Amino acid sequence: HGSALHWRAAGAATVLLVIVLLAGSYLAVLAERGAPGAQLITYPRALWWACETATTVXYGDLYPVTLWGRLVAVVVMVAGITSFGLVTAALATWFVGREQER
Amino acid sequence: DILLTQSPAILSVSPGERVSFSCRASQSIGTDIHWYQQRTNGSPRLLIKYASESISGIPSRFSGSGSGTDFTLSINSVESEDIANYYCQQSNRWPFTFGSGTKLEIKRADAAPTVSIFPPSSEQLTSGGASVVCFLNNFYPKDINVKWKIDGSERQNGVLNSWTDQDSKDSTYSMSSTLTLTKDEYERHNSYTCEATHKTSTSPIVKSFN
Amino acid sequence: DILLTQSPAILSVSPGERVSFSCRASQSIGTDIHWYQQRTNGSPRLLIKYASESISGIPSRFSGSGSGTDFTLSINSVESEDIANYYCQQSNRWPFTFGSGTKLE
Amino acid sequence: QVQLQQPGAELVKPGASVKLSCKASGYTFTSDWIHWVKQRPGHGLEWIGEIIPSYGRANYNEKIQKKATLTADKSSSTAFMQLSSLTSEDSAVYYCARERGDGYFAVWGAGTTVTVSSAKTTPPSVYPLAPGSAAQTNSMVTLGCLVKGYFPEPVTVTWNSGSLSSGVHTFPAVLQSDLYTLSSSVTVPSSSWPSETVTCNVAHPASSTKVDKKIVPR
Ligand SMILES: CCCCCCCCCO
């Protein structure tokens, strides 16, 4: 399989990001339940929270208050930012190669 | 933690009217409220989830509304099977909490009690003592009194009473009166009398046996 | 600033019962409340931190609960050494403030 | 089919400990939570705690003194609650419930009645209740069963194995001298008795006993 590395890694980052979103949702709820006042405690809204966290939006409607909930959050942020950054890098590599040919 | 207040604790309504149970949270919880029904000696049963979402198997007359702090559970045309306790529950913040509950009552038509007296069984007499049981079934309102008489003389000792909650089938009430005594005392008497005094009649309904 | 109200100021209880001290903040402070015990002529001593977290050296009969504005310090089976003044303290917003205190009888 | 199975009753000596069970059935996911709810007689629902079987983590109500300890077993799909050092305050019905991690309790168990007392278990004596020779009747006739001298609660009384449900009154038990007593009534058309069998079924889970009593004329 000799397809462009930048597109492979971009695909890998996307799949991995989806995994992080699902795992993040699960682990956040597991971490936040048991803490009085915590709102990140049911899976559907936890997945929504993971999405806005990975994109860095966030709104402030949901967020973790525990140590482990916040650690999970940081992993989600980094994975999200890295993934989108890897797509941008792949796009640049594409454009650069095509401009040489042009 | 989030306090859910259900007031009033008792709702009395005529059969066929629309009733509304109230549930108020001590802080905004969006639509994260769920409703449950618990009949006498039964387990709770989910009626409405997320304030307004219906559940399969639940009669269409059940509906829910509200958001923020004030929530309402409504029943269009109340019937006898709706007689139960109603609870709200929030899932917005940990820990989940429950409301204190609202009991539903149905104001049906006045009904005279059906009286039945039962002589002690041979199986019990053989074992030892004897119990004379009297049933006051399917009456309304629940206010009623029962008098025991032995050989024309009023008896009070050895009498244990028991009332049921409002009935799920016909919105009536029932009570059981049990006169318990030994065979050594049961034998030296002839007539045992159970009397029932109810609003539906100035004359007490009487049942006896020899 | 954040006002912490401890009512009533005096709790009277029979030896062996469960007692509950009340602490109410004038605004939401999550779980940022801490509890202290001060005996006669003594210095205050930390009993519970962050509303419910226990401290080493403190008897297990001491517990805490609540979040937002209403907080509770509880003693399961009160005994003689529990006789003291009880204070709550918030660290949610500057400046830190103290409650007025509840005496145990 | 019944998704959550709980034992009918548990008798605990003051100061002792009991381990309640909740056996799960139907669809089971990694995102399932099992909750425990305490309900004292004539009172409301009180949340005790929760456990996630797929991970084993448990949380508890902090407002109340911790009497419970939640564990689970993925093999048997059973959740357990360890109540320790019980008093009379702890005597109640304990429901287990399943939550799909979306906030509501979709299904509940039948509940386990926990009685804390120093007394001893006593099976119930069931006596038939047939009308006396002088009693007249209309279109309907009333029969009954007498459940006396049992401990502790509860007892389940059915008529003809559930076939007779309409016109059935089972009165609350009366407590006297560490023994419970109640009666159950049934009303069938007079033309059908004793032409057709009428039998009450009494079950007392605390003593693992279920007895029948056919109701024949005197
Ligand atoms: C990095 C993710 C770990 C999730 C751990 C859950 C926290 C357990 C709460 O005590």
Q: How many CA atoms lie within 13 A of B181 on its CB side?
A: 18
Beta bridge partners of B85: B38, B103
Residue from A33, A39, A41, A48 whose CB has the most chain D CBs within 10 Å, to mutate: A33
Residues of D contacting chain A (CB within 8 angstroms): 30-31, 50, 52, 55, 57, 59, 62, 101-103
State the Cα–Cα distance between residues B7 and D50, nearest whole angstrom: 28
DSSP annotation of B164 = P
C66/B1 CB distance under 8 A: yes
Domain residues of chain B, as ranges? 1-108, 109-210
SS3 content of chain A, % helix, strand, coil (to 5): 75, 0, 25
- Distant-in-sequence, close-in-space partners of C44: CB < 8 Å, separation ≥ 6: C36, C37, C38, C87
Q: Are B91 and B32 in contact (CB under 8 A)?
A: yes
DSSP annotation of B9 = S
Q: Are B129 and B183 in contact (CB under 8 A)?
A: yes
State the Cα–Cα distance between residues D85 and D83, nearest whole angstrom: 7
Q: How far is CA D198 from CA B135, D73, D159, D163, D215, in A?
A: 18, 44, 7, 10, 6
Q: Does B109-210 carry CATH code 1.10.1740.10?
A: no
Q: What's the per-residue H, E or C state across C28-40?
A: CCCCCEEEEEECC
Rounded to 10 degrees, the C-alpha dihedral D186/B163/B35/B6 comes to: 160
Fold exhibited by the domain C1-105? Immunoglobulin-like (2.60.40)
User: What CATH number does domain B1-108 carry, 2.60.260.20, 3.30.300.130, 2.30.30.700, 2.60.40.10?
Assistant: 2.60.40.10
Which chains have 3 or more CB–CB distances shorter than 8 Å to chain B? A, C, D
Q: Which domains does chain A have, with CATH numbers?
A: 1-102 (1.10.287.70)
Fold exhibited by the domain D1-118? Immunoglobulin-like (2.60.40)
**Residue among C18, C65, C76 whose CB faces D62 most closely:** C65
Which helix (DSSP H) or strand (DSSP E) does residue A14 occupy?
helix A5-32
Establish whether domains B1-108 and B109-210 are of one fold. yes
Which helix (DSSP H) or strand (DSSP E) does residue D115 occupy?
strand D112-116
Which helix (DSSP H) or strand (DSSP E) does residue D112 occupy?
strand D112-116
Using most ligand atoms within 8 A of CB, pick from A21, A25, A27, A74 the residue to mutate for ligand 1.
A27
Experimental method: X-ray
| Pair type for strands C102-104 and D4-5 | unpaired
Could you tell me the strand order of the sheet in which B144-150 lies? B153-155, B144-150, B192-198, B205-209
Enter the tokens of residue A67.
């140590």
Residue that has been written with the tokens 């400990």 in this structure? D17
Cα separation of the two ends of chain D: 41
**Residue among D30, D50, D102 whose CB faces A44 most closely:** D102
Residue in chain B nearest C65 by alpha carbon: B1
CA A68 to ligand 1: nearest atom: 7
Which chains have 3 or more CB–CB distances shorter than 8 Å to chain C? A, B, D
Using most ligand atoms within 8 A of CB, pick from A26, A30, A71, A76 the residue to mutate for ligand 1.
A30
Cis peptide before D189 (omega within 30 of 0): no
Q: How far is CA C97 from CA A32, C4, C33, C42, C51, in A?
A: 28, 7, 10, 20, 15
Domain residues of chain D, as ranges? 1-118, 119-217
Report CA(D98)–ligand 1 centroid distance (Å): 22
Residue that has been written with the tokens 């089938």 in this structure? B169
Name the CATH architecture for the domain at D119-217.
Sandwich (2.60)
76-115 in chain B: CB under 8 A from chain A: 91-95
Residue among D39, D31, D33 at smallest CA distance from D4: D33
